[PDB]
Short mmCIF file of N, CA and C in Angstrom, two decimals:
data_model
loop_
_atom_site.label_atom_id
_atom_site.label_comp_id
_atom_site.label_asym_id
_atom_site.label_seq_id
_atom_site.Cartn_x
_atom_site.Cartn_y
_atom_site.Cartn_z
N UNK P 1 2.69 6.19 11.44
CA UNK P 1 3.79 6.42 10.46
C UNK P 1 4.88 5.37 10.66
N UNK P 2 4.92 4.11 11.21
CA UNK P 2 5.05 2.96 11.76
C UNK P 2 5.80 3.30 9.86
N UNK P 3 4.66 2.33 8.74
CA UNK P 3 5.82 2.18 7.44
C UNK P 3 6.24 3.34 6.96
N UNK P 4 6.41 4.60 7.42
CA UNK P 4 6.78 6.16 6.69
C UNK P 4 7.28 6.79 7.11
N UNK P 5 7.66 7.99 7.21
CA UNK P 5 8.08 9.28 7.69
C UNK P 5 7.20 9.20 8.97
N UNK P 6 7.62 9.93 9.90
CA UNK P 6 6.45 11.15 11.04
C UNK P 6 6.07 12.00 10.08
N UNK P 7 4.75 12.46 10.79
CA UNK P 7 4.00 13.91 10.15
C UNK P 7 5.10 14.84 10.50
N UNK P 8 5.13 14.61 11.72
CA UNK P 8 5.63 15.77 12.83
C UNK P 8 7.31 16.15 11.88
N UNK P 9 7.86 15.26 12.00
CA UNK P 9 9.33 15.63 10.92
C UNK P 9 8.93 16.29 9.83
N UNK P 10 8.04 16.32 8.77
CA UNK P 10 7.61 16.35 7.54
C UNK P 10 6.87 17.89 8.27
N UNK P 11 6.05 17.65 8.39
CA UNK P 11 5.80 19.27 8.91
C UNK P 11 6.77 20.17 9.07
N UNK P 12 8.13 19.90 10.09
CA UNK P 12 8.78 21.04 10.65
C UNK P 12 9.64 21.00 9.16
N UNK P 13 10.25 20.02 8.88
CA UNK P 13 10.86 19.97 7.20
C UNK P 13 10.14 21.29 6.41
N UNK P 14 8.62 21.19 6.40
CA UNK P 14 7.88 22.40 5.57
C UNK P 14 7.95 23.56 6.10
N UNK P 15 7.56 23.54 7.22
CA UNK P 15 8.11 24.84 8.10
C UNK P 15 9.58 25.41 7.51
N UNK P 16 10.19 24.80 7.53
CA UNK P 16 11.88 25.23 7.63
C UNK P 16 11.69 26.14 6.61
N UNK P 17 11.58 25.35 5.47
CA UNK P 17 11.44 26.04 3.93
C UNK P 17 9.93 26.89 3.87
N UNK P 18 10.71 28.16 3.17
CA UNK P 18 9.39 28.97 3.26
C UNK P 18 10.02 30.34 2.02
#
């Protein structure tokens, strides 16, 4: 994820919202 986001951020981001 070097040119992007982390998964790992983007995951807990989805997590949050529910």
């Amino acid at each position: 994820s070097s040119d992007m986001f982390d998964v790992d951020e983007l995951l807990r981001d989805l997590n949050g919202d529910d």
